[PDB]
Nucleic acid binder design. Structure first.
Ligand SMILES: *CC[C@@H](C(N)=O)[N+](C)(C)C
Ligand SMILES: [Mg+2]
Ligand SMILES: [Mg+2]
Ligand SMILES: [Mg+2]
Ligand SMILES: [Mg+2]
Ligand SMILES: [Mg+2]
Ligand SMILES: [Mg+2]
Ligand SMILES: [Mg+2]
Ligand SMILES: [Mg+2]
Ligand SMILES: [Mg+2]
Ligand SMILES: [Mg+2]
Ligand SMILES: [Mg+2]
Ligand SMILES: [Mg+2]
Ligand SMILES: [Mg+2]
Ligand SMILES: [Mg+2]
Ligand SMILES: [Mg+2]
Ligand SMILES: [Mg+2]
Ligand SMILES: [Mg+2]
Ligand SMILES: [Mg+2]
Ligand SMILES: [Mg+2]
Ligand SMILES: [Mg+2]
Ligand SMILES: [Mg+2]
Lengths: 145, 165, 134, 182, 55
RNA sequence: GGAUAGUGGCCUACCAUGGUUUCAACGGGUAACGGGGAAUAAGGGUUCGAUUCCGGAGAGGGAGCCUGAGAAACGGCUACCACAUCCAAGGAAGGCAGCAGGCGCGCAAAUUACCCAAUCCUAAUUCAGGGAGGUAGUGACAAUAAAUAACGAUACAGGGCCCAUUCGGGUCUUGUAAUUGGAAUGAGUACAAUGUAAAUACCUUAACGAGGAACAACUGGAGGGCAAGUCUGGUGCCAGCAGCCG
């Protein structure tokens, strides 16, 4: 066999045009070249997003497990988009409260669902300028109301 | 978001103004007279928020009650097949609710000691007083659920999903 | 006991600056620090310079006391030492006086307030006195 | 804008985190030669690996031609002075097999312990940090100083401080005052 | 409850006044000795956190 | 020919019909300033380069120009738009993508500090100036170096054992005790002198400065992936953890 690809000492172009135009089936490269991050992906292709807790939701999870997950619909500040953020740890949406500024994070999965929370791609971090883990563990205290 | 942050930026301007949140989920602005509040809400929409303020006067409230104990007689069924539940409603005396408001009686109090106070001081059956779980809605507030009856095997699981419901 | 064992490395004689410029390796056997006024005494007697003409700086001891590596100059004369050396070194020794002056920002404010006007300030003061009636 | 003073994240982690036998083997090293961190080990391993990396990139070329011969020799010269490499082995291909254990036994940490002075190893690290030990006539409070083999003999207790015998140990100034009171 | 029920519903046991485990090198000095120097007893295989001998 | 300092379709007249293109012209995109470089790191590579150097641009936009060797300057001007100042309403003044500061934006970033002493630069110039530049402050951006006890003794246990009629001295070496004891140490302060433009801080020390209550290590984790709880109380498909498995 010749093994598909050309092998000439002067091929090059038919390699370099081929590898431009196969790469395009590499999903890493496609998002980078087409700015899905910027044009979509609620956060503007950004680590985080401050966004106002529009309501404390309970989201009934996917199968095997069964639990209502205690989330928060957010309104991302910059974009004006609305997303749904998870609130980690026992209760702690109690600590989130209502109509707070809430800083969000990606859940981990480069978009996508983290585990069983269907349609939630974000974790709360800072509620009105603290940190949920600092509240939950109570090493730090909330700045009053 | 531009409102909320401006709203906070107003509350610090004038010594009087309090920018609290209603219990039915509505922003509120306090104002010593009513002139002052038209000045604040002129200043807030410009300057501080810099955004047009859609105004209303309040919400507010309100709590219902139950008034008269019916002791009768509605019965359940959720979906089919299912079980059943039952119904009644009180209300318990306002002396009890006052303590649940004040935080003398608590959700995180001793089951036996709280129940003995309920039966003696506030008019209750001591067994029924132990058999209450919740002080809805949810942790605090003067609504209750009580378990009377005898028999029926697996009440303990649904007892919690009754409380939760 | 200690004896402040001074040494004087790298003596580069300099007619252009009218000085012997050099490093001062120094010691403290059980003493801690050498100090500068004590050094210029020890440089006066050694070089026949007198405290006035000696000018030493840098030092910063090694570590574990031990040693200190200055940068000693010895001028040809006191008048020679005055007209070459930067003012701050003459202040250190007590030869020259500390130059009492206004703050930096005040000098710049005074520069610009002066830039704002034009010509002599006697004209604007007489006009300002006339505006008291107005 | 003088210039960016360059630096290195010199000392670099391994490419897994939990090779059980490495986790022990690193403990063994930090216990034998008394090292507060894994860092102290990786420090040596990298510092060493840099040398190895040279040796490989010299041994790729023919020793007889220039760099191979010169940089290799200078690389060896450097090691024999630092005293890791033996005087039996000065053959570049031996540098390749140097190991972390040989580097650590050359530190001022250890060359305290190997010349007596301390007893029980760690004590040296404590003595070193506690401003005794002078390799030249100059105190060293880095444990991981790397001793120059030439200078090994000159390791003694400091001119200043105790053990050399200038001033005894800072509870004497307590009890000399207390005994004078009685 | 249906919001952080467990966090409340546990009896809080209080941090016991137990001595300072030493920091930096002296911590290593423990772990070196609690593996290499002391050498724990082994019926078949080595074990780094034992159990009180029971089911 | 015209212009320009000058070459030129740079501009103008008259003439010819060329010019580029699948060896991607042209067009579009760029969350593109180029390069030096950066990270990664067998080899080949990928991605990044706003950012300490070198080019290039820009000084709210887009124009136009004065002076000048050098400007299509903007810490020059003219205008129009966009934004806004100061008013006695006739009219004036503007351009932080210098430094500092503030708003705004935002996940996101410092003090309206002290200095020309350095580094250099400029002029009529040894003599003046310089938010160019340095000096601190703030600073877990990075990076480098490393304290969080050490040596005893007595008191209770592990290990070698002169010998193992049963012991045991324990002659030798190690670990545990709110025993206790002598010997240091900068973390700090502070005359001093260093340091320094002046100071700080650093290096150096007069004088004080350790005894568990102090002069206190957190972070994460503890079924697997993957290092390590089948401990004690709760919890009881919930609440929760869980990158994935679960
Ligand atoms: C799951 C089937 C169903 C039944 N047995 O009828 N329900 C008990 C009602 C849920
Ligand atoms: Mg199902
Ligand atoms: Mg010392
Ligand atoms: Mg021509
Ligand atoms: Mg661009
Ligand atoms: Mg580029
Ligand atoms: Mg660049
Ligand atoms: Mg940009
Ligand atoms: Mg440039
Ligand atoms: Mg601007
Ligand atoms: Mg212009
Ligand atoms: Mg300019
Ligand atoms: Mg400008
Ligand atoms: Mg600025
Ligand atoms: Mg930052
Ligand atoms: Mg600057
Ligand atoms: Mg700081
Ligand atoms: Mg120190
Ligand atoms: Mg922990
Ligand atoms: Mg656990
Ligand atoms: Mg494991
Ligand atoms: Mg956890």
């Amino acid at each position: 066999m010749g093994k598909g690809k050309p092998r000439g000492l002067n091929s090059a172009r038919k390699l370099r045009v081929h590898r431009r135009n196969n790469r395009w089936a590499e999903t890493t490269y496609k998002k980078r070249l087409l700015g899905t991050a910027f044009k979509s992906s609620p956060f503007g292709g950004s680590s985080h997003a401050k966004g106002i807790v529009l309501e404390k939701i309970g989201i009934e999870s996917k199968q095997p497990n069964s639990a209502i997950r205690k989330c928060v619909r957010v309104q991302l500040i910059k974009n004006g988009k609305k997303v749904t953020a998870f609130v980690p740890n026992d209760g702690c949406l109690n600590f989130v409260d209502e109509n707070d500024e809430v800083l969000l994070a990606g859940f981990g999965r480069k978009g996508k669902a983290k585990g069983d929370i269907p349609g939630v791609r974000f974790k709360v971090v800072k509620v009105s300028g603290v940190s949920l883990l600092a509240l939950w563990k109570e090493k730090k205290e909330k700045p009053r109301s | 978001p531009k409102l909320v942050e401006g709203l906070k930026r107003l509350s610090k301007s004038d010594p009087c103004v309090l920018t609290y949140m209603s219990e039915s989920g509505e922003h509120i602005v306090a104002g010593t007279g009513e002139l002052h509040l038209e000045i604040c809400l002129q200043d807030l929409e410009h300057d501080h928020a810099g955004v047009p303020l859609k105004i209303s006067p309040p919400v507010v409230a309100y709590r219902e009650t139950v008034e008269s104990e019916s002791s009768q007689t509605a019965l359940s069924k959720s979906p089919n097949k299912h079980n059943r539940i039952y119904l009644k409603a009180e209300p318990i005396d306002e002396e009890v609710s006052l303590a649940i408001e004040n935080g003398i009686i608590n959700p995180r109090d001793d089951f036996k000691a709280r129940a003995r106070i309920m039966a003696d001081d506030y008019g209750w059956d001591v067994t029924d007083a132990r058999k209450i779980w919740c002080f809805g809605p949810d942790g605090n507030g003067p609504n209750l659920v009580i378990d009377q009856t005898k028999a029926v095997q697996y009440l303990h699981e649904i007892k919690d999903s009754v409380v939760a419901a | 006991s200690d004896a402040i064992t001074i040494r004087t490395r790298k003596v580069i004689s300099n007619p252009l600056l009218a000085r012997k410029q050099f490093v001062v390796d120094v010691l403290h056997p059980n003493r801690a620090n050498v100090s500068k006024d004590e050094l210029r005494e020890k440089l006066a007697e050694a070089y026949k310079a007198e405290k006035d003409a000696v000018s030493v700086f840098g030092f910063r001891t090694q570590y574990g006391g031990g040693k200190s590596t200055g940068f000693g100059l010895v001028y040809n004369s006191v008048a020679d030492a005055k007209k070459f050396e930067p003012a701050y070194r003459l202040v250190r020794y007590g030869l020259a006086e500390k130059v009492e002056k206004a703050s930096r920002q005040q000098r710049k404010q005074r520069k610009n307030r002066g830039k704002k006007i034009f010509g002599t300030g006697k004209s604007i003061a007489k006009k300002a006195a006339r505006r008291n009636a107005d | 804008p003088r210039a960016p003073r360059t630096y290195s994240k010199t000392y670099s982690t391994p490419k897994r985190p939990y090779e059980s036998a490495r986790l022990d083997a690193e403990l063994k090293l930090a216990g034998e030669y008394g090292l507060k961190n894994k860092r102290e080990i990786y420090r040596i391993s990298f510092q060493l690996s840099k040398i190895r990396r040279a040796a490989r990139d010299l041994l790729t070329r023919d020793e007889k031609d220039p760099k191979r011969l010169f940089e290799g020799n200078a690389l060896i010269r450097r090691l024999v002075r630092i005293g890791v490499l033996s005087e039996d082995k000065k053959k570049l291909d031996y540098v390749l097999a140097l190991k972390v254990e040989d580097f650590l036994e050359r530190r001022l940490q250890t060359q305290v312990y190997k010349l007596g002075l301390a007893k029980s190893v760690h004590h040296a690290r404590v003595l070193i940090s506690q401003r005794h030990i002078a390799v030249g006539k100059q105190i060293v409070n880095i444990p991981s100083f790397m001793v120059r083999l030439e200078s090994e003999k000159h390791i003694d207790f400091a001119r200043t401080s105790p053990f050399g015998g200038a001033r005894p140990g800072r509870v004497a100034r307590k009890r000399a005052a207390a005994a004078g009171g009685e | 409850a249906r919001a952080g029920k467990v966090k409340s519903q546990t009896p809080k046991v209080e941090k016991q006044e137990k001595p300072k485990q030493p920091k930096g090198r002296a911590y290593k000095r423990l772990l070196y000795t609690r593996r290499f120097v002391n050498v724990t007893l082994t019926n078949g295989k080595r074990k780094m956190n034992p159990s009180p001998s029971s089911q």
